[PDB]
Design a binder for this molecule. Sequence first.
Ligand SMILES: *[B]([O])([O])[C]([C]N1[C]=C(C([O])=O)N=N1)[N]C(=O)[C]C1=[C][C]=[C]S1
Length: 360
Amino acid sequence: APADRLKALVDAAVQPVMKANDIPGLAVAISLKGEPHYFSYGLASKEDGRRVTPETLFEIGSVSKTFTATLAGYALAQDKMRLDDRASQHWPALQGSRFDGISLLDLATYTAGGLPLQFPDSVQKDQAQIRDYYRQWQPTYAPGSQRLYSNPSIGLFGYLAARSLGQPFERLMEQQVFPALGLEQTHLDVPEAALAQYAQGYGKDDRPLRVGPGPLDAEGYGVKTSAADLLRFVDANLHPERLDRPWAQALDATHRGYYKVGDMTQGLGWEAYDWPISLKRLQAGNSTPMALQPHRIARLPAPQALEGQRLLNKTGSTNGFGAYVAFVPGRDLGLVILANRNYPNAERVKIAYAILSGLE
Ligand SMILES: *[B]([O])([O])[C]([C]N1[C]=C(C([O])=O)N=N1)[N]C(=O)[C]C1=[C][C]=[C]S1
């Protein structure tokens, strides 16, 4: 009966949203009081009929920012950087630029002063072009005043965290972070031997879409993972104390809130809400205006622990994929929803809320 009831709950949440948003394939993974549960739907590739499983690789887009935040958490744990460091401390090319007056915390939490959502199309994936973009950039408004969600912002945060550790970002993630977290199905660059697991992404007219190269792609949106591996990452977040101490500290650093915008408290990578909260408020925190428009922050007098009666979440997208992760620290509950269509955040939150409400 319990297995029947959980399947009925997850099917009732997922099936209508997959039909309504024409989602070819979707993987759910749930962590419930220390037990994993998997529900897999539809096709990883329509053309060859390959089914989604909990081992199918999906692009998770901006959920990658929580991995980037974890690497920065490790640099913080090792005293290689501080959040109040000036950004230019960690990259001499930026000495004498406006990054002399911008903190690593501003970059991490999108408050550097108007760095845009994406790099402009004029900046290709090229070390010199990225360098020259930051050297010339000037804030629209005072650092630490307005949140404008931004890949160049947290991307530079991750880049500088890697520089503080003396190695390239992608190398540190592959050689140190993923192994420390027990993740063998999590990739920035999918190996040839794993390509058979890589789902197809679908856009307009079902155009096939896998993510192409871009500046600081690894830091902003580069992770491909399975539902089973992303749930292992959620379980690490629910129990940092089970990891070796420097990695436990790295994860704890991603559970600290610095300011509020509306109902949302901004951490490193993770975004948090009081729990319970209405579905409409959770959708509004994850809305298009929250992602695209500047918002004045309400700064906390001290960093706030993102634990207890809270939901921590992150949306992530690419042109072909739509991911959502949410967990409730004080209930030992975690959820992953990975799909191969970029379907609206409101609909991802609708699935998650139905499941989390039904487990509670
Ligand atoms: B991340 O998912 O927040 C980020 C930016 N983004 C896209 C969306 C969306 O479409 O709803 N919301 N936020 N993702 C990326 O920059 C990766 C992309 C690669 C190609 C298109 S988006």
